[PDB]
Amino acid sequence: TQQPIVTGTSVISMKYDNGVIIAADNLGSYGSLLRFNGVERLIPVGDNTVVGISGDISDMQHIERLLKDLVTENAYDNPLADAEEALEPSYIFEYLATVMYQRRSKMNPLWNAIIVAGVQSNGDQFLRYVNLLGVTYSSPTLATGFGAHMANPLLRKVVDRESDIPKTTVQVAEEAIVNAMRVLYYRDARSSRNFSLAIIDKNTGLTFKKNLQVENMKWDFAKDIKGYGTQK
Amino acid sequence: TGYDLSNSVFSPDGRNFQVEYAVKAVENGTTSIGIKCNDGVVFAVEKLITSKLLVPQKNVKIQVVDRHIGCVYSGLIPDGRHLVNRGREEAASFKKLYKTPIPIPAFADRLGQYVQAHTLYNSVRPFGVSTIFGGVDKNGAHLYMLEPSGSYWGYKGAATGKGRQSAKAELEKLVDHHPEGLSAREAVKQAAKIIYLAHEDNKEKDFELEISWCSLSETNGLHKFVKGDLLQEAIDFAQK
């Protein structure tokens, strides 16, 4: 891809004491036109991994096809496919990062930013980021694009250090994620009111919530705003 | 006479002797069976326990293609694995091109073309395996058998290997006695019984039974091995 055409907005995520939470809106925009509504940008790979993708939608669909192919290939000649030989978030991220960097090296990148979230077999949380240049990094909170400027400051209020992870319950983390989504809908012009969220927990299973809408907003004070400067 | 020393050489009577020798190699393998039920397919196979040092439940024979195709074969096992790898590549290409799991007859034709292409030249050797495969698609359940010559057909019940005659007789009796058809679990039990009966030809070594199935109402149209209480029930029914 040399230039994106249909693009999705930011994906936000954070780790808490037991698992990870990730979220993204359901809008595919076409150059300032809010063209497509109902685009799922969170892809669950198995029961312990969710991949959130932002950027070009066609490249996102290509990546979804690659992930499904990877699952099918892992299932071949593997009686422990639903066991200790199942795919792990680390494997998936390493594969995706290899693909991204190789395609960057060929001047034919996948114009995307990707967050892989999940829980390892030993129970440790996993949360990592890789973009169209192949740059990878990890942090207790992750966000790409616009969210990286507005979601990260709020989420880092809850989990500012690695030591804050054991203190953070799932309820607090989910409330913070929802509030960050509301802020993004307030201030991002390419965003949508409808989004999806995913919780990966080490004790309970994967919980995938769809059709989540930004709740009660503050708009009443707008009635007090008169014309600019000196009017009225 | 001299017409048997190279592949793709017609004999005066219109025969290819290398393919017949490959059939002879197939006839020296273990017995593999497939049964077509009302809404799916069941594959069963016998594995000889040559030595007690073999780890039980390992050394899996039945193989899966995509998420809905089951395959088993009799003959030279590495040839069967080669054919299954080719079939997996074909299924992947079809899925990538047309965004739909490959229909079973199309998969059968692709396998048949690949097998037949190895009877066209003297620089290659024919496959020494007979393959029973099948699954479920939008049209329903399909069961096929493919021979070293590349010819394949659809069957109500198929059997191959050393104990093929008794297995075929049992399958014919089973088909005759159930004109309406069979359920998936009943098919699993009958496959266990038929494999146990066909093993009676070779009493020199002990055997392990392996069963897999693909049905709409039991696996939601996916291929799954039989490993839990159902496998033990089938074994008890067969030994009864």
Side-chain angles (χ1 to χ4, degrees):
Chain A
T1 302
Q2 302 299 324
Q3 194 71 17
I5 312 298
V6 185
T7 303
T9 28
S10 55
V11 181
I12 68 171
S13 60
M14 73 185 306
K15 297 193 290 192
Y16 63 98
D17 66 336
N18 283 341
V20 187
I21 299 181
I22 193 168
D25 72 348
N26 301 326
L27 170 61
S29 68
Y30 179 75
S32 297
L33 167 65
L34 316 176
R35 191 168 177 183
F36 300 109
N37 296 324
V39 179
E40 179 59 60
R41 304 194 288 117
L42 298 177
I43 300 95
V45 183
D47 197 18
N48 55 10
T49 314
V50 173
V51 172
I53 306 175
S54 71
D56 187 74
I57 298 298
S58 63
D59 290 338
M60 185 185 76
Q61 297 174 339
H62 176 69
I63 292 175
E64 300 180 41
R65 206 171 195 90
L66 289 183
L67 295 177
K68 282 172 295 188
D69 297 330
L70 190 62
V71 170
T72 299
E73 288 290 332
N74 183 78
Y76 281 159
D77 299 327
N78 181 18
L80 301 179
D82 198 1
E84 44 274 351
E85 290 296 340
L87 281 174
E88 289 184 328
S90 183
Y91 308 159
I92 301 170
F93 183 89
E94 203 71 19
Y95 172 68
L96 289 177
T98 305
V99 171
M100 301 300 291
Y101 183 75
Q102 284 177 349
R103 293 190 52 100
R104 178 223 76 113
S105 299
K106 294 298 181 175
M107 299 297 183
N108 189 27
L110 292 168
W111 214 278
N112 291 123
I114 302 170
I115 292 178
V116 180
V119 171
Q120 294 286 90
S121 58
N122 57 9
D124 301 332
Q125 301 101 347
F126 186 96
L127 187 65
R128 206 162 171 86
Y129 168 104
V130 55
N131 62 11
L132 58 93
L133 303 91
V135 170
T136 62
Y137 48 78
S138 183
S139 178
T141 66
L142 282 181
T144 180
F146 191 85
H149 301 289
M150 300 194 72
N152 274 341
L154 301 183
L155 301 180
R156 290 168 183 174
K157 264 191 168 184
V158 180
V159 183
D160 194 66
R161 295 169 177 272
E162 71 289 339
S163 312
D164 291 326
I165 298 175
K167 305 173 183 179
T168 310
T169 62
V170 60
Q171 294 79 12
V172 175
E174 179 171 5
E175 290 179 4
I177 290 294
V178 170
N179 186 77
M181 293 303 290
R182 173 167 49 198
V183 170
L184 291 179
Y185 181 64
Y186 277 166
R187 292 290 166 170
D188 186 17
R190 305 294 182 264
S191 283
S192 175
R193 194 182 56 175
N194 307 276
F195 67 96
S196 297
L197 190 144
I199 299 170
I200 310 179
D201 186 6
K202 68 181 180 182
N203 299 326
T204 56
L206 167 64
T207 300
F208 205 104
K209 295 187 178 186
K210 303 173 182 179
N211 309 330
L212 296 177
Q213 303 187 4
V214 174
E215 296 300 330
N216 35 255
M217 328 182 190
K218 292 182 176 182
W219 291 102
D220 285 327
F221 68 104
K223 76 185 176 179
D224 303 319
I225 297 292
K226 295 303 178 179
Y228 65 98
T230 63
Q231 183 173 350
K232 237 67 169 184
Chain B
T1 64
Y3 304 93
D4 322 24
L5 299 186
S6 294
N7 340 86
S8 76
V9 170
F10 282 110
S11 75
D13 296 308
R15 295 184 179 185
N16 188 4
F17 282 105
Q18 282 295 328
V19 173
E20 296 178 351
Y21 299 167
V23 174
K24 292 303 181 184
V26 171
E27 292 172 359
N28 288 328
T30 58
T31 304
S32 308
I33 185 196
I35 305 181
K36 176 181 167 184
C37 73
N38 282 338
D39 65 330
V41 194
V42 177
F43 309 90
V45 69
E46 137 192 345
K47 316 192 300 176
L48 295 183
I49 307 173
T50 67
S51 179
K52 201 188 304 177
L53 298 169
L54 289 170
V55 180
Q57 296 299 327
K58 294 297 178 182
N59 298 311
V60 184
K61 283 189 173 180
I62 300 179
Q63 287 182 283
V64 187
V65 182
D66 198 71
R67 307 188 186 187
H68 66 308
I69 299 181
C71 305
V72 67
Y73 37 82
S74 178
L76 306 180
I77 303 304
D79 288 354
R81 295 200 66 257
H82 177 102
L83 189 60
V84 166
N85 290 340
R86 179 71 185 200
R88 286 164 173 170
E89 287 183 2
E90 297 288 342
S93 291
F94 188 100
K95 200 172 196 172
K96 177 179 177 178
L97 290 182
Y98 309 113
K99 201 186 178 179
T100 174
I102 181 174
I104 313 143
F107 178 78
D109 189 70
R110 285 167 182 260
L111 280 192
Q113 300 292 336
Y114 190 71
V115 176
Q116 130 86 22
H118 287 68
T119 72
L120 292 174
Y121 317 93
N122 69 338
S123 57
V124 83
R125 173 177 63 77
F127 290 101
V129 279
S130 285
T131 305
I132 298 176
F133 58 94
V136 176
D137 59 10
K138 300 181 181 181
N139 298 320
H142 298 75
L143 174 64
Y144 288 93
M145 186 158 58
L146 213 190
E147 313 293 340
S149 69
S151 48
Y152 64 86
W153 305 106
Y155 293 77
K156 303 177 178 179
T160 185
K162 183 169 298 184
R164 60 193 178 272
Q165 309 86 334
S166 178
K168 282 177 185 175
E170 297 300 327
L171 283 168
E172 289 179 7
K173 292 184 299 179
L174 187 62
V175 172
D176 293 330
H177 284 293
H178 301 95
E180 293 78 15
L182 291 178
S183 59
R185 304 180 180 184
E186 192 173 18
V188 173
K189 298 180 185 179
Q190 294 296 341
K193 171 190 173 183
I194 291 177
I195 289 292
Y196 267 77
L197 290 178
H199 181 261
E200 300 294 342
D201 305 333
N202 302 119
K203 299 178 182 178
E204 51 188 331
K205 295 297 177 181
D206 197 5
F207 83 103
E208 176 185 341
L209 166 66
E210 184 178 328
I211 305 182
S212 306
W213 61 350
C214 178
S215 167
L216 180 60
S217 62
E218 300 296 330
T219 62
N220 295 23
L222 304 185
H223 183 263
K224 294 178 187 172
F225 289 83
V226 184
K227 292 297 176 180
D229 197 9
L230 191 60
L231 176 62
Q232 279 287 352
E233 179 185 9
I235 293 182
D236 298 339
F237 172 83
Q239 294 180 356
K240 180 60 61 185

